[PDB]
Amino acid sequence: ARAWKQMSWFYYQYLLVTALYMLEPWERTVFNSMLVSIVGMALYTGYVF
């Protein structure tokens, strides 16, 4: 049960490093999308090779 709570700490740890913390969540998801879709394109091209 606490593993879902321990996991959000590491996400909170990801908020501090690379300065996601005070980043106005209107803008955070914009960076989250640019975080996902580049890694989402890293998989689809990586499975080719």
Binding site: L16, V17, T18, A19, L20, Y21, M22, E24
Partner: protein, 491 residues
Amino acid sequence: IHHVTQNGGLYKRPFNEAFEETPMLVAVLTYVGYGVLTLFGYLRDFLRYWRCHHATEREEQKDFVSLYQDFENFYTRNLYMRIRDNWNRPICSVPGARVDIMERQSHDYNWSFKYTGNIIKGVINMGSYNYLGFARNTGSCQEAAAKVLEEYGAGVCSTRQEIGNLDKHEELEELVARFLGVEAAMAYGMGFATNSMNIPALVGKGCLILSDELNHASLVLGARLSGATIRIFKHNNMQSLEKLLKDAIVYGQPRTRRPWKKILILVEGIYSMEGSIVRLPEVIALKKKYKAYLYLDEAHSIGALGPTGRGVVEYFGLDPEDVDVMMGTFTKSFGASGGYIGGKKELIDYLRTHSHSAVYATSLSPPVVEQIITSMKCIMGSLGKECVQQLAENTRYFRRRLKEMGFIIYGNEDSPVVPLMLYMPAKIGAFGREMLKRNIGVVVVGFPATPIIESRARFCLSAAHTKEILDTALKEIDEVGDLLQLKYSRH
């Protein structure tokens, strides 16, 4: 005798300062933290090409050449404005050990604030210049000014070379001269206004000023106002000091090669950021080797160094008669307002004539003179001279305590200011909120007032802090430094 190493700098005690270089992996992550933040600023200001609400330059009958640079206000609205909730919090009590803080918040994302009603009480502070603990509305020390307040009033409406010159002013100027152990002394209105109005009355056009990298906004400004060549040497680098000092004499001006008219040195005792003490006997030994003068700044150092604390000169045990001019303040150990200049009687009399401030600015308020006097009486001999032995105990305890807890601390170990290193800019914005949740208010120091990879937080120790007050704070930090992983040191 401890060190007489190369320059003749005779040391009595061990020195033991610590400037731990920042780790490789830590430093790279900082630039990413700024790099994402400088990225959205161009994004945000691009969104402002149509219309968090702004100050809105008057349209009514204006729109001349615009007032501000848009780009010079970049960091103040994209890194500062995000996290400006801290270092601005109003307090509503006596800034002693526990401080009542008015609570405020912003639903407009720190663009406009609002007091709710709340008074967060019993908050341990570590960000006030209250070393010897004279910030209290109790005891007989502050009570003496109440007699002075009901008698005199709250300020001369005049100038020192004009009408306004009270007996208290003449008394205090004597009193510091015996305290410093120098010939004569003279008080000024505020400590900032001292250096910005007296240093231009000393040096002139053909002078050369050798100031440190990080003095203050005072000492730079006085060096700008006197038209004089300013040259910067590295922080506590006597080798870099002497290298400039060598070439300053064997050359002259850049344009002509005439000799310099006179030269002098601007150094401080305890540098506020990265709380460290200047290698002073290596300076006294070097200025005698090159006939330079010396301006010294005991703004933090007095009341904090030496037994029955009398600045860094007693802390090195040296004589006051080799420092050509001594300056310190009364806001940062005494709980008062203003500053002095100590020096030779020939020097003081020249500055009682050419002052910029005894001839234009109004002088001190009468009751705060009394708060200075009674505080020096409790030092010279009633919460007296036992607290400086308490603070040095509190300094030396707290300085080893965070070092063994895996934190990273700068400066000399005996320095009461505790610079605690953050590195990430988000770790600035979290830490002030985080400690405030844990009933403690501290001071975090931002980017432009530091270098890039410094971004530190700062603790002001106090003799008013007891052991239980101090150890409770040690408990709270142990969680937060764990919570933010700011355990950067290897030791």
